[PDB]
Design a protein around this ligand. Structure first.
Ligand SMILES: CC(C)c1nc(COC(N)=O)n(Cc2ccncc2)c1Sc1cc(Cl)cc(Cl)c1
Lengths: 395, 523
């Protein structure tokens, strides 16, 4: 076969990323998987003249006792020559996703480029050099594998959509998003068939988009208000006034006049009940003028709410959320990890991009356990925050 | 006997051309004699007017020396050799360990034919140009290629014999097994045999233990640290003191007793790197107490994959935590300390949790598994803070150990205002030139108080107001503040801070039975 010539953005060089430590277990699994992949020529041990390196991990997708090898090409992707999103699935009623990484394994990778896909199987306590490899084909998790297979990807999708643009399918890297606004049981059935429409070329639970929303901010409803109650209302409303400047709190603060006990009930005045109600009206809808902007980064913040409860916001301009939601019940970590996935998925669905996460956890903790419950095929960018969410009761 | 490995120069670099250092006759002749034997062995070869570059040569004393630094500045980069430390305590203890010599196997590896041209050197007229055909000595890419080549050779053997451990370091091969001397010996010979078949003749001087290795001393049943010594000086500059503190911190990792506070005070207000500083008496003591602590070398046993890994943590000083990793009571594999301070405001449980994390990562790196922890913290305690803390934490299976001091929650702020408790609306502000530090409060019951200050910020006055509130109230209080600074600080529920007011407040908060703190926007 002939290879598609790839290049690094003119002025770039390969990645030299550190490989986080793994348990013996993950090492053992990794080494099995690799020589077999070697046996098949996908990868072939490499030498020391190759200075590059990309992290690799070992995940075991549940409901099987079989390990899968995940490679972190995030960095590679950031530097592969700039290579050159169907709204409607975010609309469909039930969506499905499939893994088409395999397809790539049948495509020779450009000679001069394999060198950049070098990765290392680590050794416990570094008593062994470390098992080095490189890809000879199209690697899973690399932005360049979809872009190069594109030519043959659509060229294999026609026999289901040339004159069948009823249902919808989107492809994000190794991902296949099949959205069909059809019947529940009559869903699995239309995809289980695409599962057999690509297989003719080699590669041998649902999502509910339309049922999402950038949830509203809600003020409490009460028969009686206390000093504290009002102090909190004003607080939450103040915050909310940066998103919606029409919000007013003069009348309420009037109530906070004097120095009464925190637990004391303060009757609401007519001027105060009116303001609250106008405030309730402003908030009934998501702030105007908030649209997605491709030139911007999608950012997601998560806050732990206790009781296996985790709230999150996706936004590009702080306090201009494009979406909000909650994940719910196991431990903090497993939950935090499942949440990042759920969130990343919707993100890929709505905007076809993964967001940069701000994770409320110590870094070393995450790095050690995230692979424990990771089932996705991609890895989003993430950073770790150490500052308490002062807006954990407002957001 | 092994596929030469392709090599190239950095992006658009040229070979060396540094003129030849005209040497003397006694010198020229010696090299002439050395090149002759290496030539008749392959290692080098004459070249001629052809080749352009030139690396100068030297004849150390009668030993050939090629200054390659200027060709290593123009050669590609190689996959680093020392990937990882490693720690002596991860090493599995075998019954027998043999060490094999490689040595001359140095010139025993071929250099890429298209790179060679660049290894050209010149031998002056006795009264001769060459080039290497083998990993020259002094070439940036030779160690990497050597080890790698060596790895490839062993790969097979390591296969047909997994129960054997082989550590390749420099010019030696440390092979350990758990077989019986009869079997061990035989295997070795096979290895010797295999090694021969690739041109790695193994001499049939026997280096014995302790093996000196990267600051370590390896004995049969244990490992020790090479003695750590500090400089002997009458006059200490700022430079000296900084490097000293440097070494100390580093060494404090295994010598938890080490302190640097008094020696680092010495760095205060220092005008110059050469400025000499009289050592404080509290600094002299500390320097002496460290010299001593460092007289008793750190040591531990080797790894027994047959037993379990147990880690024990202890609350030493302030922010200081010691820990031991053992398999059998007090028979330490490794010991250390953890004392980082991740942020300005914190408390003991978060810190114990961080320490727990560190040891886990280290374990995973050293032994490939996490250990069983014995921690000085009740289940009740860690569980209350866990589900109360804003970050996601991962606790491992652990066993309690009532060995004081115990880690505990010194307090918890109420979640709802306290009914019937006096409500204090506190406040404070000042003068920017210099303080009109008037901090005080007013309560629903009419009690009121204002206190003036000196030399304090604007937020300090907010903190004061809360302190005043706290100190002047019953055991149960409600405090309303407009300070985000104060709120933030306190809401975190730290049990200690580098501040004195924050600290005073904390002890106050600890004394109380109930405390609800509320924030209201600053009008
Ligand atoms: C077979 C190899 C992997 C090995 N395993 C043990 C672990 O020790 C035991 N007991 O096997 N030892 C130490 C040793 C020292 C003296 N006598 C015997 C062994 C060694 S030798 C060694 C030598 C150096 Cl320079 C560096 C390292 Cl990391 C190890």
């Amino acid at each position: 076969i002939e290879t598609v010539p790839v290049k690094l953005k003119p002025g770039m060089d390969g990645p030299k990323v550190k490989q986080w430590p793994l348990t013996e277990e993950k090492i053992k699994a990794l080494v099995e998987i690799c020589t077999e992949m070697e046996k098949e020529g996908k990868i072939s041990k490499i030498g020391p003249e190759n200075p590059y390196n990309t992290p690799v991990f070992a995940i075991k997708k549940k409901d099987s006792t079989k390990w899968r090898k995940l490679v972190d090409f995030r960095e590679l992707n950031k530097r592969t020559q700039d290579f050159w999103h169907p709204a409607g699935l975010k609309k469909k009623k039930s969506v499905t996703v499939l893994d088409v990484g395999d397809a790539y394994f049948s495509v020779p990778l450009d000679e001069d480029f394999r060198k950049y896909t070098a990765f290392t199987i680590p050794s416990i306590n570094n008593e062994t050099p470390g098992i080095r490899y490189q890809y000879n084909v199209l690697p899973q998790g690399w932005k360049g594998s979809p872009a190069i297979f594109q030519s043959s990807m659509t060229k294999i999708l026609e026999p289901f959509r040339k004159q069948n643009p009823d249902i919808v399918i989107y492809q994000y890297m190794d991902d296949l998003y099949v959205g069909s606004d059809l019947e529940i049981g009559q869903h699995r059935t239309k995809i289980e068939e695409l599962r057999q429409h690509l297989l003719r070329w080699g590669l041998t639970y649902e999502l509910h988009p339309d049922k999402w929303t950038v949830q509203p901010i809600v003020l409490p409803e009460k028969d009686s208000w206390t000093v504290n109650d009002i102090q909190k209302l004003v607080g939450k409303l103040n915050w909310a006034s940066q998103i919606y400047p029409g919000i007013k709190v003069r009348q309420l603060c009037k109530l906070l006049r004097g120095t009464k006990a925190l637990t004391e009930v303060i009757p609401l005045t007519e001027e105060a009940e009116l303001e609250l109600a106008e405030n309730r009206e402003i908030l009934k809808e998501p702030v105007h003028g908030v649209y997605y902007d491709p030139s911007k980064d999608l950012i997601a913040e998560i806050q732990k709410q206790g009781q296996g409860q985790w709230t999150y916001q996706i936004y590009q301009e702080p306090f201009k959320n494009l979406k909000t939601g909650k994940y719910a019940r196991t431990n903090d970590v497993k939950q935090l990890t499942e949440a990042v996935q759920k969130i990343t998925t919707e993100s890929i669905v709505i905007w076809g991009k993964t967001p940069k996460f701000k994770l409320p956890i110590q870094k070393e903790t995450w790095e050690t356990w995230w692979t424990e419950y990771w089932q996705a095929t991609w890895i989003p960018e993430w950073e770790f925050v150490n500052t308490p969410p002062l807006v954990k009761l407002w957001y | 006997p092994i596929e030469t490995v392709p090599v190239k120069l950095k992006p658009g670099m040229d070979g060396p051309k540094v003129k030849q250092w005209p040497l003397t006759e006694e010198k020229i002749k010696a090299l002439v004699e050395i090149c002759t034997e290496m030539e008749k062995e392959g290692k080098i070869s004459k070249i001629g007017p052809e080749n352009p570059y030139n690396t100068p040569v030297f004849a150390i004393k009668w030993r050939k020396l090629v200054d390659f630094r200027e060709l290593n500045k123009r050669t590609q980069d190689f996959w680093e050799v020392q990937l990882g430390i490693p720690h002596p305590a991860g090493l599995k203890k075998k019954k027998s360990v043999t060490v094999l010599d490689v040595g001359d196997a140095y010139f025993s590896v071929p250099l890429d034919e298209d790179f060679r041209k660049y290894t050209a050197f010149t031998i002056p007229s006795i009264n001769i140009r060459y080039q290497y055909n083998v990993l020259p000595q002094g070439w940036k890419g030779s160690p990497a290629i050597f080890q790698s080549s060596m790895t490839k050779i062993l790969e097979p053997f390591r296969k047909q014999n997994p129960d054997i451990v082989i550590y390749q370091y420099m010019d030696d091969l440390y092979v350990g097994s758990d077989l019986e001397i009869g079997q061990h010996r035989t295997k070795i010979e096979e290895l010797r045999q295999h090694l021969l078949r690739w041109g790695l003749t193994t001499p049939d001087h026997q280096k014995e233990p302790p093996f000196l290795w990267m600051g370590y001393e390896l004995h049969p049943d244990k490992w020790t640290v090479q003695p750590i010594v500090l400089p002997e000086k009458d006059s200490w500059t700022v430079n000296d003191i900084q490097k000293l503190v440097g070494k100390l911190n580093w060494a404090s990792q295994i010598y938890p007793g080490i302190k640097v506070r008094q020696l680092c005070k010495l760095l205060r207000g220092t005008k110059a790197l050469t400025e000499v500083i009289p050592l404080t008496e509290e600094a002299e003591l500390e320097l002496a107490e460290n010299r001593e602590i460092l007289k008793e070398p750190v040591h531990g046993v080797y790894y027994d994959p047959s037993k379990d890994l147990i880690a024990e943590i202890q609350k030493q000083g302030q922010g200081q935590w010691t820990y031991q990793i053992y398999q059998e009571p007090f028979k330490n594999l490794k010991t250390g300390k953890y004392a980082r301070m991740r942020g300005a405001h914190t408390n003991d449980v978060k810190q114990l949790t961080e320490a727990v994390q560190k040891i886990t990562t280290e374990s995973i790196v050293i032994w490939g598994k996490t250990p069983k922890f014995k921690l000085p913290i009740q289940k009740e305690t860690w569980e209350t803070w866990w589900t109360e803390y804003w970050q996601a934490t991962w606790i491992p299976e652990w066993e309690f150990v009532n060995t004081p001091p115990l880690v505990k929650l010194w307090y918890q702020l109420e979640k709802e205002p306290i009914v019937g408790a006096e409500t204090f609306y506190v406040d404070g502000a000042a003068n920017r030139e210099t303080k009109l530090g008037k901090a005080g409060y007013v309560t629903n019951r009419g009690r009121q108080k204002v206190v003036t200050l000196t030399d304090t910020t604007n937020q300090k006055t907010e903190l004061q107001a809360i302190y005043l509130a706290l100190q002047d109230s019953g055991l149960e209080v409600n405090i309303v503040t407009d300070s985000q600074y104060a709120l933030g600080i306190i809401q975190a529920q730290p049990d200690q801070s580098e501040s004195e007011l924050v600290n005073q407040i904390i002890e106050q908060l600890i004394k109380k039975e109930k405390v609800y703190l509320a924030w209201v926007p600053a009008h």
